[PDB]
Structure 1
């Protein structure tokens, strides 16, 4: 959904359709995002 705001969550309503169902069945207990990529 296109949103002009980039600093605050917008106001409205939209439903998310599924994209894929992965039949894996692990522990996921913790997760981390992968950003694009400290002396000086």
Structure 2
């Protein structure tokens, strides 16, 4: 998220065994980090 000029990240890590989909059942993401960057954002791009 990018709100009131801060960019925030939340994240979670889980080992799984479902062959080609997103899992059933519940988990919540703890906050990872917060960045006071003050930049506009409209698009994004993954890296392999």
Same fold? TM cut 0.5: yes
Structure 1, unpaired ranges of 5+: 34-40
Structure in which a larger fraction of residues adopt strand: 2
The two structures have a TM-score, normalised by structure 2, of: 0.59
Runs of 4+ residues deviating >6 angstroms: none
Higher RCO structure, 1 or 2 (CA under 8 Å, sep 6+): 2
CA RMSD of aligned residues (A): 1.2
TM-score normalised according to structure 1 size: 0.67
Q: Which one has a bigger Cα radius of gyration?
A: 1
